Amino acid sequence: TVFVHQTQIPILIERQDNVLFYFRLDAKESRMMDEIVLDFGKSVNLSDVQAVKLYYGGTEALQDKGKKRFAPVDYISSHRPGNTLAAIPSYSIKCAEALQPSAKVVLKSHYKLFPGINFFWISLQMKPETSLFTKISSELQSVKIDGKEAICEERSPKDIIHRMAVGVRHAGDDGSASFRIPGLVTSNKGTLLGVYDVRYNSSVDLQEYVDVGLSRSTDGGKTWEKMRLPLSFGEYDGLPAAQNGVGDPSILVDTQTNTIWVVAAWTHGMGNQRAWWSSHPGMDLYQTAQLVMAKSTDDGKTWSKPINITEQVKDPSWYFLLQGPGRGITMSDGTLVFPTQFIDSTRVPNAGIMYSKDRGKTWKMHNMARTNTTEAQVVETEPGVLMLNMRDNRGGSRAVAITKDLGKTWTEHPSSRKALQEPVCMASLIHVEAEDNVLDKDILLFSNPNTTRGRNHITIKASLDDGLTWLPEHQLMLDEGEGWGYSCLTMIDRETIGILYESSAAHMTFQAVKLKDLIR
């Protein structure tokens, strides 16, 4: 009797509903759902909560009792264009509400049960001005059925903390079906800058009507400005906009000048097919994907015309050359570095880096880090030494490599193919210097789906010993839900981590986490 699951998924601040708990019972001997009691004392900033709601979901198909679902369907969608904010009315009947609650919330349903499986769920609704650092605790006190307490089975953790998030981009925003590839940095002015594919027609990759979009925050990621487009080719050379896609962007800040650079892959032509199969050897727009960039010198507010750098660094034998999605870095000595990946003449992906020594006028690549690798992120552990963490096509474990010569030679790391599990997905790696964080320690931050299979359990991890060890104690999982998996970390300020990722709640989900919360 009474099976309970508490969610560990971001709570979107602007959402009208958020899934907090699921409930399932086979009503063999049970007549009426009387009430459900929860304690929110333990939350910080309980005042931020607009409402807590109880909803009746369905019953189940008789043949499917063994599936032991906690719901018959997803009650809220992150994919329905322009319909991601409220519970889908036809899937759920609201049976109780608690407005501006104190610690003790009683949800009085008094709801006739179906003779068989019965589903219920609780919804959390925040106020618009909710703080990013608001934390909601919701401890289940009791479930009453027929005038008396029922036995509950709750296999989910009891110490869950529901964290806040903003859906920077939701499905359907500004006429676009989807938003996919996140990149996040912090400017010298402290300005947050999020870039992504805006995939207008569908969620499909590479060749399609795709621009790279940008969201900019001047308040620590609490609010975001109207979307900008750093890169957009339209009907270039008289090909349809869907044959001029540009996406999979990466972003870096030039810490010497605050110039912001975004690099992306411009694919010309190729019909309606995947550019991973469609880009062919050669050098021009007729033949092969173009490596193009834009720059901002006014803190991300406006952007230059595109700059095609394909000639500078692309080997014509290669099928496909593009940045590694996410972010790049300015080194100690002022060098600019972007992770790279190319499909060679044998059709094998290889991760590497490219660099500019002249504020981004000219770029240069040496050699690959490892064969059969794709998306990577790169970090400077000490001056002159770069660590390349890479999506590895073999098994499910991040590959790591080291270069002290900007990619001429590579040294495998002790952690490579062992310390960080992946389902073969993008991962984010950043490095923070002691003087730049309140822990006065040197740390590697990492975020990815924490599994070998499935894109879910997006998890932030920290290392204190140069990426040798990643202690459970210094991890935090944000989203147990199924999503697209990509993420990008940044330091918001000296005490605060930022994350922009594809969650199960929203295509572009932003969350802020105090450094001390993660590490301690």
Q: What is the DSSP string of 255-284?
A: TTTTEEEEEEEE----TTS-HHHH--SSSS
Q: Which amino acid is at 298?
A: D
Give how far the C-alpha of residue 73 lies from the chain's centroid of Cα atoms, to the nearest Å.
23
d(Cα 250, Cα 194) in Å, to the nearest integer? 10
Q: In this structure, what token pair is assigned to residue 344?
A: 């060679």
User: Could you tell me which of 206, 158, 163 has the C-alpha nearest to residue 181?
Assistant: 206
Q: Which amino acid is at 270?
A: M
In the three-class reduction of DSSP (H, G, I as helix; E, B as strand; rest coil), residue 436 is classed as: helix
φ, ψ at 91 (rounded to 5°): -100, -10
Radius of gyration for the chain, computed over Cα atoms and rounded to the nearest angstrom: 24
For CA atoms 255, 260, 261, 262, give the dihedral sign: positive
For CA atoms 301, 331, 375, 517, give the dihedral sign: negative
HSE-CB of 438 using CA atoms within 13 angstroms:
14
In the CATH scheme, what is the code of domain 1-161?
Answer: 2.60.40.1290
In the CATH scheme, what is the code of domain 162-520?
Answer: 2.120.10.10
How many of the other CB atoms lie within 10 Å of CB of 479? 28
Q: Which of 14, 35, 154, 375 is catalytic?
A: 375
d(Cα 50, Cα 482) in Å, to the nearest integer? 26
For residue 170, CA distances in Å to 78, 246, 250 come to 7, 20, 20
Q: Judge contact between 269 and 276, C-beta under 8 A.
A: no
User: Could you tell me which of 139, 118, 169 has the C-alpha nearest to residue 36?
Assistant: 139
* Residues 6 or more apart in contact with residue 64 via CB below 8 angstroms: none
d(Cα 195, Cα 129) in Å, to the nearest integer? 24
Q: Judge contact between 332 and 383, C-beta under 8 A.
A: yes
Q: Judge contact between 80 and 172, C-beta under 8 A.
A: yes
Structure letter (DSSP) for residue 62: G
> 473 catalytic, yes or no?
no
Question: Resolution limit in angstroms?
Answer: 2.3
d(Cα 519, Cα 212) in Å, to the nearest integer? 34
User: Could you tell me which of 390, 245, 406 has the C-alpha nearest to residue 325?
Assistant: 390
Structural domain boundaries in the chain: 1-161, 162-520
In the three-class reduction of DSSP (H, G, I as helix; E, B as strand; rest coil), residue 520 is classed as: coil
The distance between the two most distant Cα atoms of the chain, rounded to a whole number of Å, is 76
Q: Judge contact between 194 and 224, C-beta under 8 A.
A: yes
Structure letter (DSSP) for residue 146: T
What is the per-residue DSSP string for 153-199? EE-S-SS--EEEEEEEE-TTGGG-SEE---EEEE-TT--EEEEEEEE
Q: Please state the length of the chain.
A: 520
